[PDB]
Amino acid sequence: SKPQPIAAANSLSELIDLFNSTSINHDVQCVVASTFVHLAMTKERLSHPKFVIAAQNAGNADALASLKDFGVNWIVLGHSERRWYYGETNEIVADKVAAAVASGFMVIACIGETLQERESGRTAVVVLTQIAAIAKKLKKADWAKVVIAYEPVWAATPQQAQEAHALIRSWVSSKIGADVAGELRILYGGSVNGKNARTLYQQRDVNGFLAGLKPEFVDIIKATQ
Known part of the structure; x- marks a missing residue:
């Protein structure tokens, strides 16, 4: 069977009212990741116990310490623009991930290739090098706190997403362990809506979504069964 799925989202007050009133029938960890300045409000307002608040991109020991102290236990790191715009390298993201885990966070670590990388058939070498870093x-035990989001930056069909996710899980199995591989949530971070979410989740190696904080996130949740 699949590990527990994750639905994560990366005007606002209307969105949280909506999330709060949503009945979610099945086991699924939901995550609302927000920027620093909206954190307190999101935390005051979001009360659905199947949801947790995540920080984003924090990389400083003291910052992580305060977030944790503030009751934030999740963080999203390495999201696409962090790498292709802000210049966070494979190693910078790696260190952020390690720092967060050491500070008691559950980390959604993002990886993904650009259009030029996908077009030239270098998806595998790129994606695996990112996760290798x-x-x-x-440490192997740290993987209990880790979640990988695959982001088709280059944008996708369920088959393409399945192939990417499957290649990630094979590298994990062989380099880290089959037991780690089996428990690891690998989320699909490409474009998704209520039409293809359900289709995508059906894929063998998709364990959820890293999608947009948008009214239709609710359908993305339902897509995880």
């Missing part, structure tokens, strides 16, 4: 700073 992440793995280098983590």
Whole structure:
């Protein structure tokens, strides 16, 4: 069977009212990741116990310490623009991930290739090098706290997403262990809506979504069964 799925989202007050009133029938960890300045409000307002608040991109020991102290236990790291715009390298993201885990966080670590990388058939070498860097700073036991989001930056069909996710899980199995591989949530972080979410989740190696904080996130949740 699949590990517990994750639905994570990366005007606002209307969105949280909506999430709060939503009945979610099945086992699924929901995550609302927000920017620093909206954190307190989101935390005051979001009360659905199947949801947790995540920080984003924090990389400083003291910052992580305060978030944790503030009751934030999740963080999202390495999201696409962090790498292609802000210049966070494979190693910078790796160190952020290791720092967060050491501070008691559950980490959604993002990886993904650009259009130029996908077009040239270098998806595998790129994606695996990104996670290899992440793995280098983590111990096997740390993987209990880790979640991988695959982001088709280059954008996708369920078959394409399945192939990407499957290639990630094979590298994990062989380099980290089959037991880690089996428990690891690998989320699909490409474009998704209420039409293809359900289709995508059906894929053997998709364990959820890293999608947009948007009214239709609710359908993304339902897509995880």
